[PDB]
Amino acid sequence: LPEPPRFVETQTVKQIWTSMRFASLTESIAVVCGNPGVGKTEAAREYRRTNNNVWMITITPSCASVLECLTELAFELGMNDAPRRKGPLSRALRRRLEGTQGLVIIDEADHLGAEVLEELRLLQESTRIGLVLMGNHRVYSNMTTVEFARLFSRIAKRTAINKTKKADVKAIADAWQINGEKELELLQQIAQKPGALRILNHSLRLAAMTAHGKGERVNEDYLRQAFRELDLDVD
């Protein structure tokens, strides 16, 4: 019956905003390597939504080249007049973004070739801007160890988040107006299982839509009805 919150600031969100603003204002490269289902994509989307001079793209294996990634960057910077070449595209990206004190955000940096990430680091080094990587722990694990070693000298900042926190899901429950202590422990048990923010928000929206359709309050019984579903331990 109250509003379902689309987002809440957490301890992990306040950490990743600190590292984000650090990589931007420092104008240096930071890696966010950690297991997904923790919210780094939506946190970076929230940062780009709140703050200007911030740019965030995604990288697919269908867009794993240098040219496709720079085309994504040209679409993100607001330039539909991107040349199909690699050279003058790169120099136009260098022209547009110089002096902006901007921030480039890279999601799924584990799908990168060495030439692609090398062109991105030489780009940001020739632009005096900040670069932020996302993905699993393989993003850092592809570097330990000699081809990204100068990049390992440029990579100074990383905040690695494997699993969530107690105050993390506590602030989430505060956003969703949850005060049951057994409910708190059950949400922590949800946070124990992987895909934590995903499975958590699934269970929360199931319980919320159930409590609105039945006209009631989300209780621990609606949490058991939601979390008992989704077939997580089914092989």
Next chain:
Amino acid sequence: LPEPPRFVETQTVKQIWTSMRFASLTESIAVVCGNPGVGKTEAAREYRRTNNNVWMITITPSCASVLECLTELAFELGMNDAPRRKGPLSRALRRRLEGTQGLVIIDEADHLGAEVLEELRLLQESTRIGLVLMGNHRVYSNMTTVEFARLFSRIAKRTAINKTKKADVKAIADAWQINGEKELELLQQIAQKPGALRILNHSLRLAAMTAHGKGERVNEDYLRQAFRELDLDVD
């Protein structure tokens, strides 16, 4: 002599609308795997008919590629200016649908290659929208098990409907104004045989057109005259 109902809300329809709104507002992927003749196509059509920011396509083996599916999507989103390439088409689809909080509905997801469904999940993950699959039980059975395993982490919701319910055909009979208890049992016997909604609506419209042509009421005799046809147990 009264109006033949084109649609009725059922328990299965109320379940699949719940899962549909869940996959949309959750902005995550849900699978509807189950044997056909249960009404999932017309229920999704009804949901798109009642609700805005909702998009539903179909997938044929003649349109089983990435490019044909994205062309279907571009036709569904109202963009006749779709480029024939795969790249700028995908980025235009990403531009148009971002911020819309929309819902993509996929019918017959059993005909999918791994690259096609991978491009769709990377699309919706780069669009912050909801994706709904339809088809038989092979849609989930193609995943159990490693190539869609990260998608099995994204696939959290599924409502599997094999056969219908008693209150299902009861609400259908209430839409068709049927109060015979033997008529109720005979409609349940229709629901026992597969292609349940198809064979059921066939028998209902035969009995209705028969009762209008003879100027009478649909009785159990018109139900036997309709259901005795269609040659279901003929080899």
Next chain:
Amino acid sequence: LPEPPRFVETQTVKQIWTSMRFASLTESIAVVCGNPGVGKTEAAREYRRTNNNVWMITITPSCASVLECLTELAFELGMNDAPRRKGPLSRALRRRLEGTQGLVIIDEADHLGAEVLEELRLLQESTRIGLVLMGNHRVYSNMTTVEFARLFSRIAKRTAINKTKKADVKAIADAWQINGEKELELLQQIAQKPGALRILNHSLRLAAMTAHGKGERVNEDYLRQAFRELDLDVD
């Protein structure tokens, strides 16, 4: 200090030999679909080792065609003079194997195209012999449903083994001369975890080589020392 047994007859081995001799003497097709680590490969190898007029090949994705599979068959039947064509190869395979009352054994039948398995079933139907498939549960799950439906009429026999039995690991412990009841329960706990025969034989040979290097008897402590290794619950 006694001899480590390379093989023991089990209840599952006696079942799969029954189904094997049934598919051979019946001269019809039988499917063995079940999760691996149960010993179906070594049981079929043991059957071919003990019995004549028995042939067993493997199928890789590198040999997933009709021609490569029939080349494997020609190598298995003892014919190095196999033509590189598909036709006269198939007719020579039909000539050599007719009247032999033989048995063809197929391992990893989940990697099959429809043309390959169709050529194998038309081969064995034109040879009056038995065909045995192996693999996971996807071997049968690729048929439920119309292209292998006549093959589903030819497939009459299947013995599906998901997990092991109590008398299974009891006979294994009897082969390895184990009489501890807590040791029996711990071997059953090994059998609970998947890759059951693989992980079991790994733990047994670790404990046996440890007891021979230390000059002792395999105890429950050597079982904990072996089974505590292998890093099964490590992510």
Next chain:
Amino acid sequence: LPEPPRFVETQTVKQIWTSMRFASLTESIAVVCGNPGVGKTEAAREYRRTNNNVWMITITPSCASVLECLTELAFELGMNDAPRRKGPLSRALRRRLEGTQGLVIIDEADHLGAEVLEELRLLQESTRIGLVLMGNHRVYSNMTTVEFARLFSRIAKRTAINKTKKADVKAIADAWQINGEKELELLQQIAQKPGALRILNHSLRLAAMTAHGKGERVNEDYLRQAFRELDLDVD
């Protein structure tokens, strides 16, 4: 404990031998159209095994052409010196088989093109021999209706067998030494379900191998244990 019979003469076998010898000595074309699992393949194999001047091939969709079928015929007639052309191959087949008063047997004649079956009927008409077709009821159903109409004038004989008989399974039970009346009725119930000879011989060999492994007689309980398997009514 007695010998499992590989074959028994039935009423259907005595009928199909009558039609077989009729098509041969008449030197004319006969069609055997009927649902499989009735034993027409093994009956024709038995006829070729007992009788000389008898030839039986199979036809696959991989060998659906004229040339592949005549190559099968040249392999069946004992001529490995078959030319790869269509002409001199056909004339050598006409030379070898003239004056022999032979019999050509065709299995799965439903996979035939019109040119293939036309070349076979012009072959046998230019050889003064007999031609026998096998397959489902579609073999005759592809002719009703003008392109095989002169062949419908040459096709004078057909014996269509859809399902088995009481004396059929009675003679089978006499071959398998079965004297239980409830056992007789249960074997008739096996004969009711399609794939009759296939499912029947499967159940018989399961009960026989079970009675030999347990050292007992095949009873009605072994028939229930065999026939209760095979998962026939499982979807």
